[model samples]
Target chain A: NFNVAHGLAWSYYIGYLRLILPELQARIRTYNQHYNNLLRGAVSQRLYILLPLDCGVPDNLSMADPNIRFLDKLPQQTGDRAGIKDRVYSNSIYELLENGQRAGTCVLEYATPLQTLFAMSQYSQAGFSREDRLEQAKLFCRTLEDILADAPESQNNCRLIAYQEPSFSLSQEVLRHLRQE
Target chain B: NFNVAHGLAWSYYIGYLRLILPELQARIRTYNQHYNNLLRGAVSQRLYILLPLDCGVPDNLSMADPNIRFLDKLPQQTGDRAGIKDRVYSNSIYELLENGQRAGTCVLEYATPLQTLFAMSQYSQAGFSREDRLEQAKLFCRTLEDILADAPESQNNCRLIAYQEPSFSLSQEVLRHLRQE
Candidate 1:
């Protein structure tokens, strides 16, 4: 039953991404403007890449890749709290939080490309181009795939996903509901 | 811009429901069983229908209607606050706290059919039939429509949506994002 529930939950997550990602991507520039102007000062910074480490990633494999700083241990609280924790990795560039506790296990956090763009916009005089931002976003996706590339099999629970702080609750709610079994 | 963002937000809500409702319905019975067993003596009862009086609903409407109970005013805080108020509504029944301060807005909280089924299952010799639950759920949806039927026009920022306690932060983040302009 848990495996079945897990399978159903994974499908739901895939469906949600399919339905929202295009619209989300289309509005990235506008959303970035709102996001920047909204945080005039006291800006909160941090974006996460959520993934599942349990699908096939070897426990003995080193997470210490120079590009991605994996956490020594999973955070005490993550992904709606009821779900299990796998491993956590973070660096100045991005943070990776993994959840393998439930059937629909997957990466639970990562820096969104728009968030990356916002950071870059603050430093560059020309402002980061949308094309550059999209490229960076695609690279981030590729990096996630590379991180999980060695897995022997793809578990129904495994996937890579991203979200902004504003939509975190909605994402969390969806995750929690998906975990329900 | 606010209007466009508002429209987009509504579409997202509709899309979210379309994606999750089926699985949500399928799991109701199982969830109810766990819910009932978890609350042997401490079962808290009371489901609230939150609506803003300004959202075209008559102030004179009797909240004492046998079928549903309406909250006269928006609770000071609806979600995640530590206080006596949180326990007033069950964990499953979504609370719609009225927020009329921004635009001619309101909340329309109703008993999710699953919530109703959970209640009926506690009494019926046999569990509430899925057909009955679906009908009740449909009725709840209609009631929400009826409550908003006289809305003079769609306000730029009027809506009623659900969020888990943990995700209240996300909702706040969105509201903060919406208020940026």
Candidate 2:
């Protein structure tokens, strides 16, 4: 779901996601202070993502709201409890590690940017079609892909610690293909 | 204390460090299955290390053992609570991530191989000199460097998320130099 729109929305998601998490600010040196900014010249440092921890999400987060329904189902496609958190709340920790010489991070909290994107779409007073939300989700995935793709496969040493349960199928097909069905 | 003995001891460390450690065992496709083996061709899959969490260590650990006296000092140099667990045990989790597509892991529980190594070296009845233990620690640091160095600056994508604190001085000056005093 990561695309231009998601890229466009990234700063906002990053901005919004920045405000509400219980943080542990531990990075040593100074880094990019502009939490809203993602790129620096030709580099992105790397988005160190973390899906929210298991218990971080509220219990009442129901998918009944059609706008948020995709979230409830995201758990099924992911590889672990942390996977969901990693996917949704993807950039929850990057700003804290800003201006860092090393890599960056992303988090997957249940109520992540993925959820935030769609929830915001639902606010459109009119014509917030089912397809509209689907499109937003697509951009989210592609944006994540963009994050991974730009990272120097070797040099930058992009460090993503809490990820590695697979099934790229979820990002490649399931979320967007739902529209085909 | 990551020196030649540590490098020579690395395989044994990697081998013995292979067994014992709560594992998730969830890498996809296939990776190097030789949990004991760390290098493939000329490259070392990046050792993604994790120091044991708040409670991973047992309560009875005491520095009175003298041989492991340096470990107690480690906590003072680190950045977080996970720092102590990381410094002492220093490699509790690597093998389980064997033969995967991306990255390896290292964990530092209170009883990681550092403890195991010191514990084993103590067995010699005659003279387990303080300098001898210090030498092993120095080699261990070098071996870890060898793992990071061979991994490509931008090609192989050796991922190491769980590390990044300052003061290379620990590996450079403290661990080995401990014997000088």
Candidate 3:
């Protein structure tokens, strides 16, 4: 079930995680905080939650909150929430390694698609399954690499947009800030 | 000139030294004290002192002490000192990664000669003519990698010696202590 993209995403994330949250407790905290942040945003409707749930929602749900929402529920679906988390985790990794360090300095740091695949194979026993999860992780990493590589002009705008804009929910203020040059 | 074995050895050692020295120094009085303590018995004639001159000399010289016979002149031949330091530094790196989890865990961490070569090609600036420095760095890495991959037989042997048997110089003792069971 693991593909090159998922593998690459995992590799990039692992490096980022290893650098930032090296200890088990730190890693757990990092994982929980990131997920919780995403969940909060999902509840608000600013971000579309990736997975649909199977359970029913309570009658007394708050609609006023901009960061609160539940995944869609359906039969035979454990929900794609797992995939959403994985993709978010992977994209977060791209941001960690790519955004800082003088512009071109990251070319050597970002994991290649192939290197990501290899890292996934090496560390896949932990978790990291699901096709869409793999696809999204790869999509994010590839986009980042393309931008870091600084290819032709035709590809620059598209790659830059992909690199700077992550598919997650955030405050309008933050989103606007991201939109600025 | 660039041997795979030597390259790997140097790489692992670099990892160990890079991790251990700062970690130890952050706590221990100074790097020199911890380093000398670790290598006390293994060094030739006991290297208890530090001098401006190269410690790679057959005779151990302390920077302050005059009784100790110093290498003919101050500083070693550029390559000689650099080579020795790189080797020792790399060896320390290998030990820390293998035994202690100082930086990151040592899983599939060895970089191939090609990879090392590529890293040099990509990262090295136009400081030296060609990459003689790169080759030396690779050799240093290879030396340490070899030590780590082979596991030192008994945890004290150098270059495949036996346990607690100091065949190599005193500087090699840290490497002995770093082997896994």
Candidate 4:
């Protein structure tokens, strides 16, 4: 549910960006790496993969087929992750797309551990349990994503950026810093 | 505090109406009496006085002076009951206007008894006490009214409608209705 919620939220964020940001198409191309870096800085805990859904995979790639494939081992290092790599890991590209669509996703995802920590923190807040927050988050994600997905601009060839925030786990050093505060 | 809060809330409501309603100038003039009647119907426990602050008293009136005058009789209706009859009982006009402006008002005031009841009821609600609600309401009312007062639209020749909701004393009929509910 968190995974899907994160995805949907991303979709809405993207739509929001598209609407507000000027000269986005040109900027996205000219400063793609810098833009991603900025995005990384803006949302430090998340991992993102950008994919061109409607376009053919570059010819230089070994895999002749243009379809997306999920990897057996998702990247361990946050920064090491990049655009689609050779030999997609997932069984089917369509399934991934459907899942992405279902999640109404961001271009990023939380580093795996962070997802659990964030969800727990949210649940601990007053007025709602973890399950309740999760439920509301999922609903918000799906609703926003659906609205964005239905927009005419999103229908044709478009780049899908998926991102997620990693979970928060206290390290000894971080805990020590917190003691002073 | 509750008195202030209810007053402030009413000011906000009035401001909201001013911004959203079309042809308000004409509508206010055309349906002035009907509008007051509707307001009375909606809030049965209130009395209102509409005055044009910028205009001079007609020459035909007994009192020749145009200047506002404060009187001693300021109806002690909450303290001493009075009837709606010829020669309205309020002792002072200037005192009322000054009091209204001092509150950073909405050209409105609550009947003393109604004010007490409404404020108490609001405070009895969960989470926030009556005092808090009243404080917030006063702040809201004063802020909105001040802004409205500064506007050119609200300058000289503007109409001021003063109103008060009557006290909420549950009679036997109302108590019976409550029992049915």
DockQ of each: 0.01, 0.01, 0.01, 0.01
- Docking quality of model 1: it rates as incorrect
lDDT by residue for model 2 over A33-119, one digit each (tens)? 433234532123322332221212222212211121111101111111110111121222211122223222222223234333333
Chain A superposition TM-score per model: 0.29, 0.31, 0.21, 0.30
Residue A68 CA displacement from its true place in model 2, Å: 59
Query: Candidate 4: where is the Cα deviation over 4 Å?
Result: A1-15, A20-22, A32-125, A153-181, B1-181
TM-score, candidate 2, first chain? 0.31
Off by over 4 Å in 1: A1-181, B1-8, B37-91, B94-181
TM-score against native, each model = 0.22, 0.21, 0.20, 0.21
Model 2 TM-score, 2 decimals: 0.21
Candidate 3 local lDDT, A74-119, one digit each (tens):
1111111100111111111101112322111000012223322322
Prediction 1 TM-score vs. true: 0.22
Considering every candidate listed, which one attains the maximal TM-score?
Answer: 1
Per residue, candidate 3 scores C-alpha lDDT tens digits across B1-181 of: 3322232333223323223333332222333344434632222211111111111211111221222221111111111111011111111111122222232211111122222333333332211223453444434444544444544221322222221121323223323433322
| Per-residue alpha-carbon lDDT of candidate 1 for residues A1-181, written as tens digits (9 for 90 to 100) | 1111121122222222323333432233343355323533211121223422111111121232222222222122111100111111111112222342212222223222223233333433223344454444444445435433442333332444443232133334334433452
Superposed by TM-score, candidate 4 places the C-alpha of residue A162 at a distance from the truth, in angstroms, of 8.1
| Clash number for each model | 17, 67, 43, 39
